[PDB]
Write a protein that binds this ligand. Structure first.
Ligand SMILES: CC(=O)N[C@H]1[C@H](OC[C@@H]2COCCO2)O[C@H](CO)[C@@H](O)[C@@H]1O
Length: 513
């Protein structure tokens, strides 16, 4: 381990952050050491920020221009100047705290210059501020109220619902209420959004919404708009898949089978149309090694930043330097970027550690590692998940110390490929014994077995139905896990194919119901 003095000489990065966090959790950062430390932190969010703030609370920020505005309370705000009154009324909780006579007075003060404030003040003088704001068709007010409280729910007419998509809050609003199955009046109302007024993710979610109300024609129209507007081919393919499932136009299935993106939808379409499996690149560098230390986390952070900021030309230089057996994961990572994500790279590094597992297990391990880390041994996530299999420290220590009793175990052993694959096998055994399906195992790997069990206990998830199991896959309630499962399933299919242990993705889908 490294002293705070030595860390401070490294460039700011997630690896430096991780090692500062390890000092904080072992109580090795003094109040004096902590003085300058926020300037040494690459991403000052979450656990590292809350640990540091136990040592030095952070005061700010109040823009000094408005400091005086924050000396007033709900009881004294009528004594404040007009600028101070309007600043404090940015807060809906502040508005809710006012007495209703003061809301009446302030609404009159601001009716000319700030009718938005007037609307919210008079809204909070009623028993349902949302109904008042909806009657005014005040769109900014609507989103402010929603952000204040998710509990408001009302029917919204055609005119009002068609205005909502123009506001930056709409995409997260629509996603949250559709996935969480909340706010049913809002959800039903969003059936009347004209597809011409939405695009991309929002259009897609509105398609999903329409399916849940069995409005399949409206669903098709939303999904078609999504397919036409999505920036990523993978997302476009997901929308085309729905267009096909709903209306069964054989041109849509044909377009999906010919996609340049390898994903579950394009793989499925290929299978349904007797189209050959996509071409997988074969990387076999002849050079054995270079000078690069694959076990130095700081060196990875530095080379990653260079690779990500490399122009078309500097990528070619790096490709050559890292075209060795020892740096195969870095080589594939460079090629993936250098080829503009058009070629399919499915490497199997450190294969000696898994070659004695059965091939189905190999493929699941490789599928997870590909998505988690792209096989970078010293990978570190924003939540300080570690190594190729991206173990959280807590689980790493549970397995390495309590279960396996590895002598002198430290969570940094997760950066060793032999350890990553061994622990990954261990945990995947636990999960698969309970969940069976590789998709369910992927959800549980990323999101936990508790979330996965609760999802599978519901009457409306992964049961029989017209559009199952695809619909359920769109309604997995955590976005990171929803995405993750689809990517890991595609990888699994590919690696099973590469290992001469092919399975039809249609058999995976049947086993989800
Ligand atoms: C290194 C890192 O941040 N990995 C992430 C990972 O980030 C994706 C990419 C894949 O290419 C290499 C870098 O990570 O996302 C998954 C969720 O999908 C996380 O569980 C995982 O911890």
């Amino acid at each position: 381990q490294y002293s705070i003095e030595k860390l401070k000489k490294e460039e700011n990065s997630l690896a430096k952050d991780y090692y500062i966090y390890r000092l904080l959790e072992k109580n090795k950062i003094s109040k004096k050491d902590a003085q300058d430390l926020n300037s040494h932190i690459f991403r000052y969010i979450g656990k590292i920020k809350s640990e540091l703030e136990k040592i030095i609370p952070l005061k700010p920020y109040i823009n000094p221009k408005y400091a005086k505005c924050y000396t007033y309370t709900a009881n004294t705000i009528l004594d404040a100047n007009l600028t101070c009154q309007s600043v404090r009324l940015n807060s809906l909780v502040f508005i809710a705290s006012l007495n209703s006579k003061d809301r009446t007075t302030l609404a009159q003060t601001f009716k000319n210059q700030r009718p938005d404030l007037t609307n919210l003040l008079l809204a909070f003088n009623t028993s349902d501020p949302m109904s008042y704001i909806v009657q005014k068709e005040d769109i900014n007010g609507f989103f402010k109220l929603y952000n204040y409280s998710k509990k408001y729910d009302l029917d919204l007419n055609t005119s009002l619902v068609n205005k909502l998509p123009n506001h930056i809050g709409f995409k997260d609003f629509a996603q949250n209420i559709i996935i969480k199955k909340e706010n049913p009046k809002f959800r039903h109302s969003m059936l009347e959004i004209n597809p011409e007024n939405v695009s991309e993710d929002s259009a897609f979610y509105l398609g999903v919404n329409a399916l849940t109300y069995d409005k399949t024609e409206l669903a098709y129209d939303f999904f078609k708009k999504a397919a036409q507007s999505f920036k990523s081919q993978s997302n476009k393919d997901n929308a085309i898949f729905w267009m096909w499932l709903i209306k069964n136009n054989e041109e849509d299935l044909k377009t999906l089978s010919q996609s340049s993106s390898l994903n579950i939808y394009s793989l499925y379409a290929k299978e349904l149309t007797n189209t050959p499996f996509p071409k997988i690149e074969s990387l076999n560098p002849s050079k054995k090694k270079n000078n690069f230390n694959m076990q130095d986390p700081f060196a990875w952070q530095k080379i990653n930043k260079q690779i990500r900021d490399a122009n078309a030309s500097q990528l070619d230089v790096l490709a050559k330097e890292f075209d060795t057996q020892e740096t195969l994961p870095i080589y594939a990572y460079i090629l993936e970027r250098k080829n503009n994500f058009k070629k399919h790279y499915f490497i199997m590094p450190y294969y000696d550690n898994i070659k004695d597992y059965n091939k189905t297990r190999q493929a699941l391990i490789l599928a997870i590692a590909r998505q988690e880390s792209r096989f970078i041994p010293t990978a570190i996530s924003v939540s300080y998940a570690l190594g190729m299999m991206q173990f959280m420290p807590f689980l790493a220590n549970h397995i390495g110390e309590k279960e396996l009793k590895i002598p002198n175990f430290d969570q940094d052993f997760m950066f060793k490929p032999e350890i990553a694959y061994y622990f990954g096998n261990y945990h995947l055994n636990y999960l698969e014994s309970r969940l069976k399906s590789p998709l369910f195992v992927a959800y549980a790997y990323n999101g936990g077995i508790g979330f996965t069990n609760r999802m599978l206990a519901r009457n409306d998830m992964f049961k029989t139905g017209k559009f199952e199991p695809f619909l359920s896959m769109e309604l997995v309630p955590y976005q990171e896990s929803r995405i993750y499962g689809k990517k890991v399933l595609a990888n699994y299919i590919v690696y099973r194919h590469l290992l001469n242990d092919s399975i039809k993705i249609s058999d995976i889908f049947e086993n989800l119901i």
